[PDB]
Amino acid sequence: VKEPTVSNADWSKPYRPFRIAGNLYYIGTYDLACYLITTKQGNIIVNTGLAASALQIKNNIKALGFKLTDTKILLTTQAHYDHLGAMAEIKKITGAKLMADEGDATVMADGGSSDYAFGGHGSMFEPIIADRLLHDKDTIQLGDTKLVMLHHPGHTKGSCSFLFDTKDEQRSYRILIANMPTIVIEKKFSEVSSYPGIAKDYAYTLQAMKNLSFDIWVASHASQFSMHSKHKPGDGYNPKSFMDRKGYDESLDKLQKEYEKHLN
Ligand SMILES: [Co+2]
Ligand SMILES: [Zn+2]
Ligand SMILES: [Zn+2]
């Protein structure tokens, strides 16, 4: 396994973990977004960072006063090394069930060596095998929390978002953990031959994502939802700073124009 060169220091830069809304917490790096969802029956972790991120993740969970041994479920939005780098390790240590969008099961099982965009040069992250293959609109229940997986292909063949309700003592929130449909290739869709449905998948995702409704959206990278504009370490609890429909729409507009060009 050889993790590709990382030029962006913020991918490994530690960041102080915080509560976003209800039982949703941010436990990722300065730019690689990882989430903890805490329930009465244990916890869900969504994403890791790079290979070395396992230490920070364990520490972040601890720092919020939760227990790593309460981890029951592992999810990802995206089978790329920047979001699955430490997943094999976290799964080993926790013994949690990994649930994955069927579209990415294969790439995950080979550590990214069959990746349509970065394949052919061996494993880019430690292979993981999912205990559950999820399809569009499958639900994941733990205690009183229920997640809906949304198949949002294109970024990866199985990239996906999660839609779920949480509550604090005053209010309930509909949260989208979105995988934004960014384009990873530099060439035209028509030339990406080992992913024949790539253009149709982007078209489907862009349309499906525009029509979603929620109170709060977050993304796979902190920068993609401007997390550092909405929250500083020490802010305390403030779900409302993550209410940002305009931000979401502006982002999908940009990604729509990108889709039209075919690349970046
Ligand atoms: Co299936
Ligand atoms: Zn990616
Ligand atoms: Zn990424």
Residue numbers in the entry: 28 to 45, 47 to 57, 66 to 76, 78 to 87, 89 to 161, 164 to 192, 194 to 252, 254 to 306
Quote the study on this structure.
In this study, we report the phenotypic, kinetic and structural analysis of a metallo-β-lactamase isolated by metagenomics from an uncultured bacterium from Alaskan soils. LRA-12 is a class B3, di-zinc dependent metallo-β-lactamase with highest amino acid identity to the Elizabethkingia meningoseptica GOB enzymes. Results show that LRA-12 exhibits a broad spectrum profile, since penicillins, cephalosporins, cephamycins and even carbapenems were hydrolyzed, with kcat/Km values ranging from 0.16 to 1.75 μM-1.s-1. In this sense, both LRA-12 and GOB enzymes present the highest carbapenemase activity among class B3 MBLs.
